[PDB]
Specification:
The structure is cut from a larger assembly and holds 2 copies of chain A. Chain A has 2 helices and no strands. Chain A has 48 residues and is an all-alpha fold. The longest helix of chain A is centred in the middle third of the chain and has 37 residues. At the A-B interface, helix 2 of A face helix 1 of B. Chain B binds 3 RNA strands through strand 4 and strand 5. The PDB classes it as virus/rna.
Chain lengths: 48, 146
Amino acid sequence: YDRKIASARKPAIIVKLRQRKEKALKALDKMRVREEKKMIREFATQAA
Amino acid sequence: SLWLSFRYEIMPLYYQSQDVLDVIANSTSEFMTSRDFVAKAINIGIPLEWNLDQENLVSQPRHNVMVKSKLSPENNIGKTLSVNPFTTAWELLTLSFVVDWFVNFGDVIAGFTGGYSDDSGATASWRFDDKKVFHLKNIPSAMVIV
RNA sequence: GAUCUGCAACAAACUGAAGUUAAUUAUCGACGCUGCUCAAUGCAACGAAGCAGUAAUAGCAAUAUUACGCAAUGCGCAUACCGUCAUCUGUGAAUGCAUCCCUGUUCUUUGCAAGGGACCGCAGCCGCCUGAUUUCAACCUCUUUUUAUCUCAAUAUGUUUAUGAUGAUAAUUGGAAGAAGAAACAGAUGAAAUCUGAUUUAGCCAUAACUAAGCUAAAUAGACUCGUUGAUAAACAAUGGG
RNA sequence: GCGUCUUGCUGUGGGUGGUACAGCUUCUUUUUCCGAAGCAUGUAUCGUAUGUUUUGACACAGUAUCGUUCGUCGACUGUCCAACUCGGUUCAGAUCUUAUCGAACCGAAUAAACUUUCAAGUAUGGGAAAUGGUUUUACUUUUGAAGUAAUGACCCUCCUCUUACUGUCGAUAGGUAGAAUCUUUGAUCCUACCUGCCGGGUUUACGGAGAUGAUGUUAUCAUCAAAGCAGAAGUAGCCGAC
RNA sequence: AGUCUUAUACCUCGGCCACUGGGCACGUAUCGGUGUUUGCUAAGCUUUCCAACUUAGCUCACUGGACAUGCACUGCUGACGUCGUUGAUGAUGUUUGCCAUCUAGUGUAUUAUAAUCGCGGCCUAAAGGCUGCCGCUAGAAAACACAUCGGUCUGAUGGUCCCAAUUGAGGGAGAGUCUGGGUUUGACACCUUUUCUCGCCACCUCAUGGGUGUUAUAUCCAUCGUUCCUGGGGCCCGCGGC
């Protein structure tokens, strides 16, 4: 994404790509925390 | 909005920093041990005039020795080992605090290689649970328990 | 020092004077007493005359007025506050898990385990009110026989017509709380509702000059919700034809 | 079980104080000739402090951002450590590889393993810590603004365990509060406190207008309390520094 | 025959072809709207009769849109000291900041050289093996051209160290045998292909039973599970056509 962000020059496309990054890395962090917590319960169940 | 755009770089950089901290700390706290057990016997002379069936007193102590080291390097697992600085108090506005925390963490985690050494210790333990029996030979009725 | 390229410093003088002296011009303190200042402006507190804003009038003057000036006051005006409501945002307690801090003092028949406090992060009970509303009966009452609505059906008449009601709802007779709202009683908004000149027209004035600069009245047009109320125009989802 | 005024919710309804301005009418005046009277209705207002011509308009000169930690003087020091080095800068110079050596400087570095010692110097907790006061409840139910409590708590109070935090002097530096003397109405002296500066809620305490109840005295005794100061607070910007 | 221009050839034939970064122009699938005539599609006036004109448009041109081509070409990005001002910025030298790669395969040569064997390093010291750089080929428009709602949900079992029965299965390796292919002549011999046999082949996987270890290990293996693809016979559901 920063490959295109480096040279865009058009504010509309700039803000739309920033929104794309927002949504994408938001989904990334959400799935990160969900995976971490689900593997926490997974280890708890394995120990039990 | 501009400040909340922080997550982009602070969230994953902090996540990877904690990742490297964990992957170094788990290997650094190995706490290696080594131990062994033997059942060497202990002999106590018995006077012959005592007319005992067994000539020599035998003890079987559980002999246990263990030697272990730590091998910690010269570094700062202390104050730097802290939870996310923002935690739940992101409402406090700052831009320099995060960069100062990051550079401090970086310089600390870079400066460890200079020294690596620690101490050790060893134990020598005996356990006795010997309940021995001896007969007054030629007189099986007479008997002694130790 | 390139060394037949020159530069730097030593501040005594040199035209250009950055300060004062030498001379000229202008000003004020021109009275300085406890004392004359960062070189000048400047006085808790020192001395006299006259009245204690200036000018004029009838008047020494007080006295009364006027013109200017000064001071004070008044939601008269506004400013910050709260007083004031309204709309909206917003509706609550106990339960665990996860983090940090401290701790051999009866720690210990394996040298390394066990206790106490903190708030955040993650999961666990149910109601309530407000915003504003659906629960119930129209089941004796024939001359003092509530109305309206969602509605039906037999019979007579070869018309263009005549009759009989159960269930529910409303005109709120009663209550839950729901259509919107997990940590409660606090915040946010409002205290507005017009203006143009910038369009035309009409009228006044001859205009700096041209008679009509400029001004006045009507209408058009343009800028214009401060949050609350509703619908409407368009894109969004709308399978097509013979 | 019944009837009753008043009282508290005004529970319901009604009427009522209005002022100013806007506008209308009437008389005089050249119908508001620059004056006067009455009147329908509407709006605003019926709070504090501030500014009231510091209200407004024209000219001159000037007005960068962000984020930092600090800021009455000097003294050993209440207080910073690897102090004899690290890294860089510059240079009288030398060996002349671009290179090497030497000197000064800069930033890091000397206090002591803190201070403190009436043992919470200042905060934290516990007491089979009692008195007294206050706040609940119960009982008698009658007490002199009635009484009694093996009462739930708080305050007061004595003792007591850990942890945190902190020297003084010369300043007659500046200021603050109290007290006294003289008096200029300010000054002087002494005591106590504070100093990066000057800025918000809350918490504790102080004195304290006025008010309230009682008593024999406009007098006294008890209760509340206006405004204000002080301990943490908690948040601006003021210059200087980056 | 002479001159100019376009096209091929001609060096390039956009910086690459891995990206037209953008601009320019003509060319064009061409599409809408106008200027639109000689003549024309259908209709029509003035209705016995259309046997004499016009109308909506059509040739062509212009306008706007779209596509493509090459390039004489050009850019994309604006901050330091600024300069007098202009409100925002008009200029000055400046420097930094671009579309610009990764992946898979291949690699000389000479030769008797420790002489290598595209270039260079590692292990073993042999008839060597591993790896870094470069050269030559293909994919990746990834890259510049190019993608645009939120929120929620979306597999298990056992093994993996050793041993025992080879107990069974499957797969690999070897030895031969045979069918054919390649060098050699007529061959043999060697390489290679296919069929079959073989097994103390501690080869691998699975199946069985045990034990060892805590430092057995798979970033996996095997089995099943859901979904998808291919061939669909057919009925439970089941209609249409024949």
